[PDB]
Amino acid sequence: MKLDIKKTFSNRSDRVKGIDFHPTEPWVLTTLYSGRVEIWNYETQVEVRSIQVTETPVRAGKFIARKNWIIVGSDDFRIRVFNYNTGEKVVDFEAHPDYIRSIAVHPTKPYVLSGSDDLTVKLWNWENNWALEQTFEGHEHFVMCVAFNPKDPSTFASGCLDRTVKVWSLGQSTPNFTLTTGQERGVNYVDYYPLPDKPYMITASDDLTIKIWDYQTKSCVATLEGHMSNVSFAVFHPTLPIIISGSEDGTLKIWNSSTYKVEKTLNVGLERSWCIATHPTGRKNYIASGFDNGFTVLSLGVIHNISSHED
Numbered sequence: 001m002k003l004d005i006k007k008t009f010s011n012r013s014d015r016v017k018g019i020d021f022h023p024t025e026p027w028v029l030t031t032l033y034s035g036r037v038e039i040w041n042y043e044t045q046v047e048v049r050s051i052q053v054t055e056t057p058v059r060a061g062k063f064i065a066r067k068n069w070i071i072v073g074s075d076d077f078r079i080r081v082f083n084y085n086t087g088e089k090v091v092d093f094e095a096h097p098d099y100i101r102s103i104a105v106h107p108t109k110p111y112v113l114s115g116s117d118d119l120t121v122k123l124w125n126w127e128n129n130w131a132l133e134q135t136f137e138g139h140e141h142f143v144m145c146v147a148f149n150p151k152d153p154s155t156f157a158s159g160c161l162d163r164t165v166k167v168w169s170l171g172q173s174t175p176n177f178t179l180t181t182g183q184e185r186g187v188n189y190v191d192y193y194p195l196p197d198k199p200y201m202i203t204a205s206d207d208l209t210i211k212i213w214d215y216q217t218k219s220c221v222a223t224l225e226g227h228m229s230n231v232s233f234a235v236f237h238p239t240l241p242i243i244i245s246g247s248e249d250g251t252l253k254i255w256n257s258s259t260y261k262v263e264k265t266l267n268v269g270l271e272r273s274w275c276i277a278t279h280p281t282g283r284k285n286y287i288a289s290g291f292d293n294g295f296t297v298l299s300l301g302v303i304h305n306i307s308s309h310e311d
Contacts, residue, residue: 002308003240003254003264004301008286009042010268016275016290018061018072018103023280028288030295031061031072039070039084042288042297049084060103060114067126073100073114079124091130095122102145107153111170115143121158123170136168138175145189151196159203161186167215179218183207189233202243204231210245212260222260226253232274239282240300246273246289268296 018031026043035054040047056075064071064081069090071081077097081090096116104113110127121136121143141161148156149167155176157167163186166175181187183205193200200221201213210224210231224234229248236243236257243255250271254264270291279286285300 002303006299008297008299010296012294015292016295017059019275019277019290020062021277021279022063023065031058033057062105075099104146113146115146117142150194157190159187159190165190191235193236194238202234204234206230210234226262233276248272270294
């Protein structure tokens, strides 16, 4: 209901394009516009590893903690996987002949999805030598974001500058459905509400709007306005009744996920916001965002009756 937002750690660096939390260690992975990737322990404030991977932007990065890996994608067209304990480069392959925008990791099968400016999503299988298993075609502009449905990870969503979201089934060449968003400058980000109580998705656009979608009715539930520049992302928090968005206006916004009204605007002083992560297990309700001048990790904390000053 009412939240106390605390700044756990902020680190100034080059522009953070991708970010991810490790599920069991208090670490965040950041992928930078300079071609560097970094892992930081945000509780001790100590850098655990850094790698100059390339001299092009690294826009996408995720942990594959069950394999002790990070996986990153860069504008030089390549996907690279590193063991974060040894530093070994496990694989290095051309994934797409254009920029890689987004990487998603399946929760229980050895699958990774990549979305690209080449108009496609690709599925890679690490238990079959990182083979290209399937290319999902049908989008008509840059594929900006890919995300598995955490409630049914045999399906996933792609968001695209062609103004659509497509939801797909692994193994099938045509989408289960296509959502025409009416966000006329395209979709930069798509995410799922993670719990069973709502059949919802969410998109963010350069047209300054965030939209909530019902995948049963294929309808727009709500439109959230307030950002003054391109909206880079918007996500449902996995446990708290809020949506979190970030924008080239330099702010994070927190919105009520029931009424869709804004609640807070946070300016953490790092210029434009590009990316978001939420802790996989909800530990301390940690969230993290990457910006032009670095990243911040925040803890969310619910305010109970003793301190909420309701009387």
